[PDB]
Amino acid sequence: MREIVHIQAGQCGNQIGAKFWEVISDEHGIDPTGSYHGDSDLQLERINVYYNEATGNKYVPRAILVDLEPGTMDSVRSGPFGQIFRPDNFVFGQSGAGNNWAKGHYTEGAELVDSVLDVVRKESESCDCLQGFQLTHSLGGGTGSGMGTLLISKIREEYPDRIMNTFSVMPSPKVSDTVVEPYNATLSVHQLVENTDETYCIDNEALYDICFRTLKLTTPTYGDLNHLVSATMSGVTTCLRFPGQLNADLRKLAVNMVPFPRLHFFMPGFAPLLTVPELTQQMFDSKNMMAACDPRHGRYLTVAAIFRGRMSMKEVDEQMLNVQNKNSSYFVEWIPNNVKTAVCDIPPRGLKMSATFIGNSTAIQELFKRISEQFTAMFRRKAFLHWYTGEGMDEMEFTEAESNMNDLVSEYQQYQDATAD
Amino acid sequence: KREHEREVIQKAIEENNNFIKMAKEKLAQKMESNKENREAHLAAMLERLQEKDKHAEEVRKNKELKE
Amino acid sequence: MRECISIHVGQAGVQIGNACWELYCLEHGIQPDGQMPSDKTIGGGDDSFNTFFSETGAGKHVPRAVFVDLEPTVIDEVRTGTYRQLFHPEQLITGKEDAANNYARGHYTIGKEIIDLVLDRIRKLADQCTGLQGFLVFHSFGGGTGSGFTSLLMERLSVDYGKKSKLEFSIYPAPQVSTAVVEPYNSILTTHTTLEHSDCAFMVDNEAIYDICRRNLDIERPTYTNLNRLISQIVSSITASLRFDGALNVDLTEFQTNLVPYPRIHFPLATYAPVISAEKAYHEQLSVAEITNACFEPANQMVKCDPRHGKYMACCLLYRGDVVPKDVNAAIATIKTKRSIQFVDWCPTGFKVGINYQPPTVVPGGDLAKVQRAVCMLSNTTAIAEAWARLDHKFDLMYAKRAFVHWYVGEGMEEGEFSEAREDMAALEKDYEEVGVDSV
Ligand SMILES: Nc1nc2c(ncn2[C@@H]2O[C@H](COP(=O)(O)OP(=O)(O)OP(=O)(O)O)[C@@H](O)[C@H]2O)c(=O)[nH]1
Ligand SMILES: Nc1nc2c(ncn2[C@@H]2O[C@H](COP(=O)(O)OP(=O)(O)O)[C@@H](O)[C@H]2O)c(=O)[nH]1
Ligand SMILES: CCOc1ccc(C2=Nn3c(nnc3-c3ccccc3OC)SC2)cc1
Ligand SMILES: [Ca+2]
Ligand SMILES: [Mg+2]
Ligand SMILES: [Mg+2]
């Protein structure tokens, strides 16, 4: 009864969104045709969270595909699990963004945003009790960054009491398309802090290093990076899709993980990439983080983790309390019992047992310091500003975006150096 | 002593009724206060979003003056 | 006559109620369909079990209770549970959206939509009673519905029923089984609001119960089923004086007369005995003198605290099963000379004893062993203030940085409500110190 409307925008947003639906369809026993052929009744107890039950016992994914060019969305249709999506939810443009945040948020995206909302309202009136909206997109692009943050602001106008969740993809020089990426990122972050309740920081620099160093891939394609994103998203929504001792929803997650409305950016983690203590120690390791931030360089505010697969309930409870006592310096004292953990009996496809991690560490400021450094490195020389100013923007808006992001870092620094007495 | 027995039982009723009276007022206060406050937060939040719309209208207008 | 309408709010109260009413049906002999062969009087009666169970024309004995939750996923299990026929559809009330562990959403936002509906269902149960005695509210301290909606409910009940007795069975939060963070926030807020609207409140520390089931029942990771079935035994022994009769049976309100010296001091320290597995109970009879000594042991208390570090203001013993006064009077005399029992100088030191001859009953498949006798101690000690101490400490840690407060403010509450709730809690701990200090 707790439905969640999914939206994907941009070239990156649609591909990482497509992979998300492919994985969870396997974990719920859903074929590309849209039928059910599972074996457990635990797959259909919370199936109406992401799927709509239509005529012929079909489970159509509550997803809205948005882009400014047919190039990416055409691949989703012809690819696997492409005939399962609702044909009317495909909202695409023709002009494109050209990796420009200005065009996506003010020019091009504003001409198509109203057509997207019509699909959103249709998928919200069929909800018994709408949780909120999860958005998958990139911040280093144009459509996903510009129109992505644009859709959010427009959604909160009609749904102000609903929770806004996002899977933002942080750009990186290692996997860079253009040079104006730090601009699009900063202008996106400036919007995310104001209109989101919780945002997953999927950093490409972190994804690249994992595939390169650990997974041993000399030439990491986009497919290898998304495989880590798919498993990450599959984990963080396990308790949302599978029943258990814990009644989970988006708001309750936001209530417990966000002590301060501005500091709502998390740090995903997955393991492996085997016993319980080994799986536990590898989950809090800096190499298994989906964000290029060493957790020992900062302190945790709120921590949540999932343990999938058949394992000892007693052993899990011991290992979690063991990683806290041996590392009590990396956790704030003014937030008692700031580490929660639940166990799912159903493991991911192709794994005996896994572990997904979510952390609201103050060490996430390193991610913002990196982007801000790249931002101010080009903005001080007024480089590539004719792309944005030509769309009707000014240097004042860039200053606000920079200033707001710099304040956010100071906020993470404040509660990090904060003590109890 | 007869008029004393009347005073005691009447005072008990007066205190009991006052307990119900004050409780109803304290409750209606919080319920009205919480209502106005929540509406204010929503009114403020929507206003900030409507300012983004006005700002968005000026950006598309500023580009129009360059064509 | 003298009926008691129970109320179960939130996932805690409902699931606990599932264990309590299942235990009631076992002790009285009521089938899951509602039929009770021992009851010859059809339509009703003035028997002792008519306090918690009303009767119909079909012979179906219906519990005088109302289950309410802001989300249906909990009560829906009761609608399709084993005892689904036992309740009437108008007694199981559900919403569509929970409070999401938020006091403001439970007390104001979501609660306001259903609160008028709940009272109307409560009123219908009240109009069926010949003479209402009071209410029984089962809830958790930290749950958004168990703390928010409960406080909203207790205020309304005080208006619609005046100063009629309302007893609480709150669930004190515990880190080992803590559902979600901000537990102390919801706990302080519901304790502050219900304080002047509750005549007596029995606290149950989840950690205290958790430790018993690991020690006395040898369970590695006890589930909610293991805890609730244990709690139900305590609740059963307390209400045993209301559901049964006897020559040595003493009414609960007579115990309550001693347990409450001051309006603000209505938090007794419950202690049950004996808790023992079937393997350990085989070929080992536990006498009256042995289960009494277990009552004065900190490891068997429902709330973790140290009575030796505090003073007693009242002490009651509710025995059940094959128990005679001869053994009790001999037992107490022994304990009084081997324990750290220190009363305050403004109240008697004598113990009040109640005995119910109906033997205890265990849930089939339960971990508890079918014993011949049991005892529940309700002692009003100043050492229960230690419970508020650990809770207020954790509260002050988060409010010192205003963490998680914006979720409450954003729903309508003010910081003034927080500051007012804490200053009241600080006043409560002070009152527990004032009652402990010797006279002049
Ligand atoms: N002992 C015991 N405690 C429980 C049980 N179920 C829930 N609780 C307690 O309840 C607290 C959370 O509230 P819940 O009862 O789970 O749900 P709720 O009160 O309706 O709160 P919301 O989520 O806001 O709706 C937890 O801290 C638990 O300690 C139970 O079965 N046994
Ligand atoms: N993980 C992942 N990242 C991507 C993918 N495609 C693009 N990106 C990232 O997104 C940025 C470019 O965004 P882009 O896709 O062009 O946005 P759009 O033009 O609005 O659709 C680059 O910095 C890439 O690192 C993808 O398929 N997977
Ligand atoms: C630190 C404060 O304590 C907490 C209290 C409650 C939660 C809830 N978990 N939750 C929800 N939805 N997804 C999750 C989740 C996400 C990632 C990992 C583990 C999860 O939990 C199974 S609902 C509430 C989390 C932390
Ligand atoms: Ca009868
Ligand atoms: Mg591109
Ligand atoms: Mg609940």
Side-chain angles (χ1 to χ4, degrees), chain A residues 361-384:
Chain A
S361 177
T362 62
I364 201 62
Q365 58 173 334
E366 296 182 348
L367 188 146
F368 296 97
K369 283 185 177 180
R370 181 193 62 190
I371 303 301
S372 181
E373 178 184 358
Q374 301 174 4
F375 177 80
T376 189
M378 300 179 59
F379 186 73
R380 65 178 60 258
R381 66 177 186 268
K382 309 298 184 58
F384 302 94

PDB file of all heavy atoms in Angstrom, chain A residues 361-384:
ATOM      1  N   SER A 361      28.353  10.203   7.243  1.00  0.00           N
ATOM      2  CA  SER A 361      29.614  10.635   7.836  1.00  0.00           C
ATOM      3  C   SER A 361      29.936  12.090   7.520  1.00  0.00           C
ATOM      4  O   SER A 361      29.537  12.615   6.481  1.00  0.00           O
ATOM      5  CB  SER A 361      30.759   9.739   7.359  1.00  0.00           C
ATOM      6  OG  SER A 361      32.004  10.188   7.870  1.00  0.00           O
ATOM      7  N   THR A 362      30.670  12.733   8.422  1.00  0.00           N
ATOM      8  CA  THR A 362      31.099  14.112   8.222  1.00  0.00           C
ATOM      9  C   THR A 362      32.307  14.172   7.294  1.00  0.00           C
ATOM     10  O   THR A 362      32.774  15.253   6.937  1.00  0.00           O
ATOM     11  CB  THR A 362      31.452  14.796   9.554  1.00  0.00           C
ATOM     12  OG1 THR A 362      32.554  14.118  10.167  1.00  0.00           O
ATOM     13  CG2 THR A 362      30.259  14.772  10.498  1.00  0.00           C
ATOM     14  N   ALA A 363      32.808  13.003   6.907  1.00  0.00           N
ATOM     15  CA  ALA A 363      33.945  12.914   5.999  1.00  0.00           C
ATOM     16  C   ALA A 363      33.493  13.057   4.552  1.00  0.00           C
ATOM     17  O   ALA A 363      34.305  13.001   3.628  1.00  0.00           O
ATOM     18  CB  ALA A 363      34.683  11.601   6.198  1.00  0.00           C
ATOM     19  N   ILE A 364      32.192  13.246   4.364  1.00  0.00           N
ATOM     20  CA  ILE A 364      31.623  13.422   3.035  1.00  0.00           C
ATOM     21  C   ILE A 364      31.991  14.795   2.474  1.00  0.00           C
ATOM     22  O   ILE A 364      31.803  15.064   1.288  1.00  0.00           O
ATOM     23  CB  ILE A 364      30.083  13.258   3.055  1.00  0.00           C
ATOM     24  CG1 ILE A 364      29.548  12.928   1.658  1.00  0.00           C
ATOM     25  CG2 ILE A 364      29.417  14.503   3.621  1.00  0.00           C
ATOM     26  CD1 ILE A 364      30.066  11.623   1.095  1.00  0.00           C
ATOM     27  N   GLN A 365      32.529  15.657   3.332  1.00  0.00           N
ATOM     28  CA  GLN A 365      32.935  16.996   2.922  1.00  0.00           C
ATOM     29  C   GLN A 365      34.072  16.951   1.905  1.00  0.00           C
ATOM     30  O   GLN A 365      34.260  17.891   1.133  1.00  0.00           O
ATOM     31  CB  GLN A 365      33.354  17.823   4.135  1.00  0.00           C
ATOM     32  CG  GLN A 365      34.492  17.212   4.930  1.00  0.00           C
ATOM     33  CD  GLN A 365      34.989  18.125   6.030  1.00  0.00           C
ATOM     34  OE1 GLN A 365      34.853  19.345   5.949  1.00  0.00           O
ATOM     35  NE2 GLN A 365      35.567  17.537   7.069  1.00  0.00           N
ATOM     36  N   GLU A 366      34.829  15.857   1.911  1.00  0.00           N
ATOM     37  CA  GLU A 366      35.926  15.678   0.968  1.00  0.00           C
ATOM     38  C   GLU A 366      35.409  15.618  -0.464  1.00  0.00           C
ATOM     39  O   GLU A 366      36.073  16.073  -1.396  1.00  0.00           O
ATOM     40  CB  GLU A 366      36.713  14.408   1.292  1.00  0.00           C
ATOM     41  CG  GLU A 366      37.409  14.434   2.639  1.00  0.00           C
ATOM     42  CD  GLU A 366      38.211  13.175   2.897  1.00  0.00           C
ATOM     43  OE1 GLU A 366      38.043  12.197   2.138  1.00  0.00           O
ATOM     44  OE2 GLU A 366      39.008  13.163   3.859  1.00  0.00           O
ATOM     45  N   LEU A 367      34.219  15.049  -0.629  1.00  0.00           N
ATOM     46  CA  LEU A 367      33.589  14.955  -1.937  1.00  0.00           C
ATOM     47  C   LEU A 367      33.214  16.341  -2.445  1.00  0.00           C
ATOM     48  O   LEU A 367      33.346  16.635  -3.633  1.00  0.00           O
ATOM     49  CB  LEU A 367      32.353  14.053  -1.871  1.00  0.00           C
ATOM     50  CG  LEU A 367      31.646  13.682  -3.178  1.00  0.00           C
ATOM     51  CD1 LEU A 367      31.091  12.269  -3.085  1.00  0.00           C
ATOM     52  CD2 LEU A 367      30.529  14.665  -3.508  1.00  0.00           C
ATOM     53  N   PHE A 368      32.750  17.192  -1.538  1.00  0.00           N
ATOM     54  CA  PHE A 368      32.338  18.542  -1.898  1.00  0.00           C
ATOM     55  C   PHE A 368      33.534  19.473  -2.064  1.00  0.00           C
ATOM     56  O   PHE A 368      33.504  20.383  -2.890  1.00  0.00           O
ATOM     57  CB  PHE A 368      31.373  19.103  -0.853  1.00  0.00           C
ATOM     58  CG  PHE A 368      30.078  18.349  -0.762  1.00  0.00           C
ATOM     59  CD1 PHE A 368      29.893  17.375   0.203  1.00  0.00           C
ATOM     60  CD2 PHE A 368      29.042  18.617  -1.643  1.00  0.00           C
ATOM     61  CE1 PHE A 368      28.701  16.681   0.291  1.00  0.00           C
ATOM     62  CE2 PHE A 368      27.848  17.927  -1.560  1.00  0.00           C
ATOM     63  CZ  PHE A 368      27.678  16.959  -0.592  1.00  0.00           C
ATOM     64  N   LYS A 369      34.582  19.245  -1.278  1.00  0.00           N
ATOM     65  CA  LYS A 369      35.803  20.037  -1.392  1.00  0.00           C
ATOM     66  C   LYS A 369      36.474  19.806  -2.741  1.00  0.00           C
ATOM     67  O   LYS A 369      37.080  20.713  -3.311  1.00  0.00           O
ATOM     68  CB  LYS A 369      36.778  19.705  -0.261  1.00  0.00           C
ATOM     69  CG  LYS A 369      36.417  20.321   1.081  1.00  0.00           C
ATOM     70  CD  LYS A 369      37.500  20.052   2.112  1.00  0.00           C
ATOM     71  CE  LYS A 369      37.190  20.734   3.433  1.00  0.00           C
ATOM     72  NZ  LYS A 369      38.239  20.469   4.454  1.00  0.00           N
ATOM     73  N   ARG A 370      36.358  18.581  -3.244  1.00  0.00           N
ATOM     74  CA  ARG A 370      36.941  18.214  -4.527  1.00  0.00           C
ATOM     75  C   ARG A 370      36.223  18.915  -5.677  1.00  0.00           C
ATOM     76  O   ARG A 370      36.860  19.474  -6.570  1.00  0.00           O
ATOM     77  CB  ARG A 370      36.888  16.698  -4.719  1.00  0.00           C
ATOM     78  CG  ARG A 370      37.497  16.210  -6.021  1.00  0.00           C
ATOM     79  CD  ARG A 370      37.125  14.760  -6.272  1.00  0.00           C
ATOM     80  NE  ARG A 370      35.680  14.592  -6.400  1.00  0.00           N
ATOM     81  CZ  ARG A 370      35.064  13.416  -6.440  1.00  0.00           C
ATOM     82  NH1 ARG A 370      35.764  12.294  -6.356  1.00  0.00           N
ATOM     83  NH2 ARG A 370      33.744  13.361  -6.558  1.00  0.00           N
ATOM     84  N   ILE A 371      34.895  18.878  -5.647  1.00  0.00           N
ATOM     85  CA  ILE A 371      34.085  19.517  -6.677  1.00  0.00           C
ATOM     86  C   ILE A 371      34.227  21.035  -6.623  1.00  0.00           C
ATOM     87  O   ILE A 371      34.340  21.693  -7.656  1.00  0.00           O
ATOM     88  CB  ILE A 371      32.599  19.134  -6.540  1.00  0.00           C
ATOM     89  CG1 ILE A 371      32.433  17.615  -6.593  1.00  0.00           C
ATOM     90  CG2 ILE A 371      31.771  19.796  -7.628  1.00  0.00           C
ATOM     91  CD1 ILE A 371      32.953  16.989  -7.866  1.00  0.00           C
ATOM     92  N   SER A 372      34.229  21.584  -5.410  1.00  0.00           N
ATOM     93  CA  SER A 372      34.372  23.024  -5.222  1.00  0.00           C
ATOM     94  C   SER A 372      35.724  23.516  -5.723  1.00  0.00           C
ATOM     95  O   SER A 372      35.826  24.610  -6.276  1.00  0.00           O
ATOM     96  CB  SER A 372      34.195  23.395  -3.748  1.00  0.00           C
ATOM     97  OG  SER A 372      34.302  24.797  -3.563  1.00  0.00           O
ATOM     98  N   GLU A 373      36.757  22.704  -5.523  1.00  0.00           N
ATOM     99  CA  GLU A 373      38.095  23.041  -5.995  1.00  0.00           C
ATOM    100  C   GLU A 373      38.128  23.117  -7.518  1.00  0.00           C
ATOM    101  O   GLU A 373      38.707  24.039  -8.091  1.00  0.00           O
ATOM    102  CB  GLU A 373      39.119  22.020  -5.496  1.00  0.00           C
ATOM    103  CG  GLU A 373      40.535  22.278  -5.986  1.00  0.00           C
ATOM    104  CD  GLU A 373      41.509  21.201  -5.551  1.00  0.00           C
ATOM    105  OE1 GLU A 373      41.089  20.274  -4.825  1.00  0.00           O
ATOM    106  OE2 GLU A 373      42.695  21.282  -5.937  1.00  0.00           O
ATOM    107  N   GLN A 374      37.499  22.141  -8.166  1.00  0.00           N
ATOM    108  CA  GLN A 374      37.424  22.108  -9.622  1.00  0.00           C
ATOM    109  C   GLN A 374      36.536  23.232 -10.143  1.00  0.00           C
ATOM    110  O   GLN A 374      36.761  23.765 -11.230  1.00  0.00           O
ATOM    111  CB  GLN A 374      36.896  20.755 -10.100  1.00  0.00           C
ATOM    112  CG  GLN A 374      37.738  19.572  -9.661  1.00  0.00           C
ATOM    113  CD  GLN A 374      37.104  18.243 -10.020  1.00  0.00           C
ATOM    114  OE1 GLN A 374      36.058  18.196 -10.667  1.00  0.00           O
ATOM    115  NE2 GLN A 374      37.736  17.153  -9.598  1.00  0.00           N
ATOM    116  N   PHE A 375      35.527  23.583  -9.355  1.00  0.00           N
ATOM    117  CA  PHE A 375      34.600  24.646  -9.717  1.00  0.00           C
ATOM    118  C   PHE A 375      35.284  26.007  -9.696  1.00  0.00           C
ATOM    119  O   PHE A 375      35.207  26.766 -10.662  1.00  0.00           O
ATOM    120  CB  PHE A 375      33.396  24.648  -8.770  1.00  0.00           C
ATOM    121  CG  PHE A 375      32.425  25.765  -9.025  1.00  0.00           C
ATOM    122  CD1 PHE A 375      31.494  25.671 -10.046  1.00  0.00           C
ATOM    123  CD2 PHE A 375      32.442  26.908  -8.245  1.00  0.00           C
ATOM    124  CE1 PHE A 375      30.597  26.696 -10.283  1.00  0.00           C
ATOM    125  CE2 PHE A 375      31.550  27.937  -8.479  1.00  0.00           C
ATOM    126  CZ  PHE A 375      30.625  27.830  -9.499  1.00  0.00           C
ATOM    127  N   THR A 376      35.959  26.309  -8.592  1.00  0.00           N
ATOM    128  CA  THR A 376      36.608  27.603  -8.426  1.00  0.00           C
ATOM    129  C   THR A 376      37.857  27.723  -9.294  1.00  0.00           C
ATOM    130  O   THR A 376      38.374  28.821  -9.497  1.00  0.00           O
ATOM    131  CB  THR A 376      36.988  27.859  -6.954  1.00  0.00           C
ATOM    132  OG1 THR A 376      37.433  29.212  -6.799  1.00  0.00           O
ATOM    133  CG2 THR A 376      38.093  26.912  -6.512  1.00  0.00           C
ATOM    134  N   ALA A 377      38.339  26.595  -9.805  1.00  0.00           N
ATOM    135  CA  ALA A 377      39.530  26.588 -10.648  1.00  0.00           C
ATOM    136  C   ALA A 377      39.216  27.114 -12.043  1.00  0.00           C
ATOM    137  O   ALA A 377      40.096  27.621 -12.740  1.00  0.00           O
ATOM    138  CB  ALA A 377      40.114  25.187 -10.730  1.00  0.00           C
ATOM    139  N   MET A 378      37.955  26.989 -12.444  1.00  0.00           N
ATOM    140  CA  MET A 378      37.527  27.421 -13.768  1.00  0.00           C
ATOM    141  C   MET A 378      36.727  28.717 -13.702  1.00  0.00           C
ATOM    142  O   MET A 378      36.695  29.486 -14.663  1.00  0.00           O
ATOM    143  CB  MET A 378      36.693  26.329 -14.443  1.00  0.00           C
ATOM    144  CG  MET A 378      37.427  25.010 -14.628  1.00  0.00           C
ATOM    145  SD  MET A 378      36.395  23.741 -15.389  1.00  0.00           S
ATOM    146  CE  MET A 378      35.956  24.537 -16.932  1.00  0.00           C
ATOM    147  N   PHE A 379      36.083  28.954 -12.564  1.00  0.00           N
ATOM    148  CA  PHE A 379      35.214  30.114 -12.411  1.00  0.00           C
ATOM    149  C   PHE A 379      36.006  31.388 -12.121  1.00  0.00           C
ATOM    150  O   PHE A 379      35.528  32.495 -12.370  1.00  0.00           O
ATOM    151  CB  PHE A 379      34.186  29.866 -11.304  1.00  0.00           C
ATOM    152  CG  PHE A 379      33.160  30.954 -11.172  1.00  0.00           C
ATOM    153  CD1 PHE A 379      32.154  31.092 -12.116  1.00  0.00           C
ATOM    154  CD2 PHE A 379      33.196  31.835 -10.105  1.00  0.00           C
ATOM    155  CE1 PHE A 379      31.209  32.093 -12.000  1.00  0.00           C
ATOM    156  CE2 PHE A 379      32.251  32.836  -9.982  1.00  0.00           C
ATOM    157  CZ  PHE A 379      31.256  32.965 -10.930  1.00  0.00           C
ATOM    158  N   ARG A 380      37.219  31.228 -11.601  1.00  0.00           N
ATOM    159  CA  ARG A 380      38.066  32.375 -11.294  1.00  0.00           C
ATOM    160  C   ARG A 380      38.636  32.993 -12.566  1.00  0.00           C
ATOM    161  O   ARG A 380      39.032  34.158 -12.575  1.00  0.00           O
ATOM    162  CB  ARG A 380      39.202  31.972 -10.354  1.00  0.00           C
ATOM    163  CG  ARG A 380      40.195  30.993 -10.957  1.00  0.00           C
ATOM    164  CD  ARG A 380      41.324  30.674  -9.986  1.00  0.00           C
ATOM    165  NE  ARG A 380      40.839  30.077  -8.743  1.00  0.00           N
ATOM    166  CZ  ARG A 380      40.705  30.736  -7.597  1.00  0.00           C
ATOM    167  NH1 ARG A 380      41.023  32.022  -7.527  1.00  0.00           N
ATOM    168  NH2 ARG A 380      40.255  30.110  -6.519  1.00  0.00           N
ATOM    169  N   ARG A 381      38.675  32.207 -13.637  1.00  0.00           N
ATOM    170  CA  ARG A 381      39.166  32.694 -14.920  1.00  0.00           C
ATOM    171  C   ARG A 381      38.017  32.869 -15.909  1.00  0.00           C
ATOM    172  O   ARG A 381      38.241  33.126 -17.094  1.00  0.00           O
ATOM    173  CB  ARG A 381      40.222  31.744 -15.494  1.00  0.00           C
ATOM    174  CG  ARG A 381      39.695  30.368 -15.875  1.00  0.00           C
ATOM    175  CD  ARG A 381      40.790  29.514 -16.499  1.00  0.00           C
ATOM    176  NE  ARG A 381      40.280  28.240 -17.000  1.00  0.00           N
ATOM    177  CZ  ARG A 381      40.241  27.117 -16.291  1.00  0.00           C
ATOM    178  NH1 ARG A 381      40.684  27.103 -15.041  1.00  0.00           N
ATOM    179  NH2 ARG A 381      39.759  26.007 -16.832  1.00  0.00           N
ATOM    180  N   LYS A 382      36.792  32.726 -15.405  1.00  0.00           N
ATOM    181  CA  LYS A 382      35.574  32.899 -16.197  1.00  0.00           C
ATOM    182  C   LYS A 382      35.541  31.985 -17.419  1.00  0.00           C
ATOM    183  O   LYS A 382      35.093  32.386 -18.494  1.00  0.00           O
ATOM    184  CB  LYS A 382      35.426  34.359 -16.640  1.00  0.00           C
ATOM    185  CG  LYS A 382      35.551  35.376 -15.515  1.00  0.00           C
ATOM    186  CD  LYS A 382      34.462  35.194 -14.471  1.00  0.00           C
ATOM    187  CE  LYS A 382      34.541  36.275 -13.406  1.00  0.00           C
ATOM    188  NZ  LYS A 382      34.425  37.642 -13.990  1.00  0.00           N
ATOM    189  N   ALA A 383      36.014  30.754 -17.250  1.00  0.00           N
ATOM    190  CA  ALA A 383      36.103  29.810 -18.358  1.00  0.00           C
ATOM    191  C   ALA A 383      34.761  29.146 -18.648  1.00  0.00           C
ATOM    192  O   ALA A 383      34.064  28.715 -17.731  1.00  0.00           O
ATOM    193  CB  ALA A 383      37.159  28.755 -18.067  1.00  0.00           C
ATOM    194  N   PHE A 384      34.416  29.074 -19.931  1.00  0.00           N
ATOM    195  CA  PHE A 384      33.204  28.402 -20.397  1.00  0.00           C
ATOM    196  C   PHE A 384      31.938  28.934 -19.731  1.00  0.00           C
ATOM    197  O   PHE A 384      31.064  28.161 -19.340  1.00  0.00           O
ATOM    198  CB  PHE A 384      33.312  26.892 -20.167  1.00  0.00           C
ATOM    199  CG  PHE A 384      34.493  26.260 -20.846  1.00  0.00           C
ATOM    200  CD1 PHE A 384      35.684  26.075 -20.164  1.00  0.00           C
ATOM    201  CD2 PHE A 384      34.412  25.849 -22.167  1.00  0.00           C
ATOM    202  CE1 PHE A 384      36.773  25.494 -20.786  1.00  0.00           C
ATOM    203  CE2 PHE A 384      35.496  25.267 -22.794  1.00  0.00           C
ATOM    204  CZ  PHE A 384      36.678  25.089 -22.103  1.00  0.00           C
TER     205      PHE A 384
END
